[PDB]
Amino acid sequence: IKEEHTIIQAEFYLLPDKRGEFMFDFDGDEIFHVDIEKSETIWRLEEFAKFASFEAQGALANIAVDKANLDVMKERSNNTPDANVAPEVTVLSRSPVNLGEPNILICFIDKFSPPVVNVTWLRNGRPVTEGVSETVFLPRDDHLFRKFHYLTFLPSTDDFYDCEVDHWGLEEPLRKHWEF
Amino acid sequence: SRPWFLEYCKSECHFYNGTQRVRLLVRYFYNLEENLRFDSDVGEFRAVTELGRPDAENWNSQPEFLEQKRAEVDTVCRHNYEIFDNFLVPRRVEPTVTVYPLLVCSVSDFYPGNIEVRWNGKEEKTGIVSTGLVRNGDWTFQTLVMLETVTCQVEHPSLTDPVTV
Amino acid sequence: ADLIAYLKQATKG
């Protein structure tokens, strides 16, 4: 028997957006993150909360300390900035798509920093609000981030979907198409 | 372009084999660059680049701090693992396979990522292209195994006996 | 539902 595993405590603070994140992952899937503003623990799968708790307030303090380190860092490079990195976007089903069978469509945004993006689901060229899921910025082995968007869908020959992904490195919103 | 500022830190608990061999690795990135590491196999902070030298100097001169990080292999890593060992480590999600006309094998909705896929009588050791392993993001994997000749078997930690076609 | 442990972030400066 061998149990090779990796747990990660991933946290960041981003300026000037003033956004922060604190999450855990196991082998590359998120176990939970902390809603900074609400100060609570959001478990990635519902079933998890029955095996484990976490004290959110600790994450908040961590973020605040990160924020203060950032200020220390800026001053050490002399406010010297860096170039943006553009998202690779990809769209795909969660299972084999079957006409008249409920399914989930996945927008996979990859290899991008900073960890801020505008992302919109388009059904037949028009913005979608219902049945959309968002996933905090997830860690990678490197210094880049990845993210998953999920929209519920019903397979149809008529419908045609797009993922519109806006990022600072891109010259303009890259959209990605998906028809049955 | 638009100027930004990131303080990014990852605290990685590496288990080579459950609690038998545990490595703590704390990594500091400023912007797009990793500047500082603490590696429990080393016991100290090491700058990755000039931008991290002052943190390593500040921190390695705090002896009780180095003493605390070393113990974190036990106080955090080992501790957290004994909990995750109840539900995450033994998580078993059985795969569903579907074959459609190159020949298409569909393996989906499974966890963990460890999977064996192969294809009359003898599996073709040639002419195979795959999507690799695909991470859904909701704690399930899916992958496509294709044969280009004008039955597939699947082995996986959730199944005592292989699944065929 | 055991509590999970974490690292406190360190002070730079």
């Epitope: 303090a61 | 701090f65 113990a71 106080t75 501790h79 | -």
Partner: T-cell receptor, first 114, second 109 residues
Framework: MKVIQTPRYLVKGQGQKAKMRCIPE?????VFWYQQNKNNEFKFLIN????????QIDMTEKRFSAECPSNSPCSLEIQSSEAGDSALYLC????????????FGPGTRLLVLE | QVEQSPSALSLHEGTGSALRCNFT?????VQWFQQNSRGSLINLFY???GTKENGRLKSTFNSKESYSTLHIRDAQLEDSGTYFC?????????????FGQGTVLSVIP
Amino acid sequence: MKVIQTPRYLVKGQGQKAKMRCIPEKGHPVVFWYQQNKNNEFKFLINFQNQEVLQQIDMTEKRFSAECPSNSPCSLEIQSSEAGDSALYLCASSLNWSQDTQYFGPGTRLLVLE
Amino acid sequence: QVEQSPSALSLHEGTGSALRCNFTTTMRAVQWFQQNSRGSLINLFYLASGTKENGRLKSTFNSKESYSTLHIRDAQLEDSGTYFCAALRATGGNNKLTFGQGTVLSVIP
């Protein structure tokens, strides 16, 4: 340099403000306040890193006011003293948020009379 | 939660004994303090593992077995006072030390 706390003792009547002064060791960003009672029980009140408050309990946000302005001494002040506030108030400084070692001031013994 | 014993101890000059702190969860490290007659807390020890020796005192901490001990040897009058251990649990959201119940140590002249 040891931690400094004044005043050593402090008597006040219900309704008054009680104000305590602490000077952390030179070069310690993190600062804590506790109450200790006569049965030797300790209660944590508030957390600071540098000028900024990180953590504090419900009571303190409601009845207390505290500051650690840069290069000046730290202070804690009860807004409207009650008899239940009688306690030894203790200040401690650490060098680093991520590391537990704490050094304590001599305290302020506060007594609140009617 | 931190159970500390014994509650009280009287020691003849030049004799010794030990204090103990058992933790109900994983602690990050442990500290021991003496509160003297003026009520000032003196740092006796910080440790995150192993055993440390300082003068007439020695201390062991074990995170996994979850206890800490404090040894006082060859007691002197100046040792009288109230002794505390103090730990932060690695799961605790608030960065604050939790204290043992304390041992009141009396050295008999």
